[PDB]
Design a protein around this motif. Structure first.
Motif, PDB file in Angstrom:
ATOM      1  N   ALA A  45      -4.092   0.641  -0.653  1.00 44.69           N
ATOM      2  CA  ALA A  45      -3.265   0.311  -1.809  1.00 44.69           C
ATOM      3  C   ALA A  45      -3.996   0.596  -3.112  1.00 44.69           C
ATOM      4  N   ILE A  66       8.751   7.020   1.654  1.00 45.39           N
ATOM      5  CA  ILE A  66       7.315   6.784   1.485  1.00 45.39           C
ATOM      6  C   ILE A  66       6.604   8.125   1.400  1.00 45.39           C
ATOM      7  N   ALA A 103       0.822  -1.206   0.000  1.00 43.38           N
ATOM      8  CA  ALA A 103       0.000   0.000   0.000  1.00 43.38           C
ATOM      9  C   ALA A 103       0.858   1.260   0.000  1.00 43.38           C
ATOM     10  N   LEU A 104       1.940   1.268   0.777  1.00 40.35           N
ATOM     11  CA  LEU A 104       2.740   2.481   0.914  1.00 40.35           C
ATOM     12  C   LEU A 104       3.610   2.749  -0.309  1.00 40.35           C
ATOM     13  N   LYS A 105       3.993   1.713  -1.055  1.00 44.83           N
ATOM     14  CA  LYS A 105       4.845   1.898  -2.222  1.00 44.83           C
ATOM     15  C   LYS A 105       4.058   1.892  -3.526  1.00 44.83           C
ATOM     16  N   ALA A 106       2.732   1.959  -3.451  1.00 49.86           N
ATOM     17  CA  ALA A 106       1.886   2.018  -4.635  1.00 49.86           C
ATOM     18  C   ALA A 106       2.214   3.240  -5.492  1.00 49.86           C
ATOM     19  N   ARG A 119       0.522   8.763   1.043  1.00 46.30           N
ATOM     20  CA  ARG A 119       0.255   7.331   1.124  1.00 46.30           C
ATOM     21  C   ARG A 119       0.150   6.875   2.578  1.00 46.30           C
TER      22      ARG A 119
END
Lengths: 91, 98
Positions: B8, B51, A41-44, B55
């Motif tokens: 995501a 990051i 999710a964080l590196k999407a 997000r």
């Protein structure tokens, strides 16, 4: 590698597969299912495939890809995946 | 959990996504948008990474929805906004499998 082939061959939802990854990761410093999902999710590739792919890669990095592939085949057979298709992943 | 799945999947900016979070949190003790923003901004400060903060904000908001029991309502609201931005319907079914 075999991690990508396995991830691309399986038909199980991550909702089921996450239990096998969580079982076979025991004793290793591989990421937990919360950590894998959060990192994705964080590196999407569809999201559910990405999670399966990341799990299988992590299994290969930490030396339990063979154990995970055995568990996935078992879960597939429990959900009636035909043996002719299990033959594809046995190779 | 489905919070991580939703976070995501969404491509909405926080500027827009904060509206559906704020709308669906009614009646609960979930943090407000400014409380989430300050908390996440401090966390990103104490653990600097590559990051994107947006997000982290979105993930925190989805986790907070799950904790206070409006994640399903937030997923519906997010999908409506994404549909308003013409997110392809093939991608909407990927998240609708929850």
């Amino acid at each position: 590698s075999n991690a990508e082939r396995l991830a691309a061959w399986t038909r199980l939802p991550w909702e089921g597969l996450r239990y096998s990854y969580n079982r076979e990761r025991r004793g290793t410093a591989a990421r937990s299912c919360p950590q894998l999902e959060a990192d994705v999710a964080l590196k999407a590739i569809p999201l559910e495939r990405q999670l399966i792919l990341e799990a299988c890669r992590e299994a290969e990095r930490f030396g339990f890809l063979h154990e995970l592939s055995i568990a996935i085949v078992e879960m597939e057979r429990l959900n009636k995946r035909p043996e002719a298709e299990v033959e594809e992943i046995a190779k």
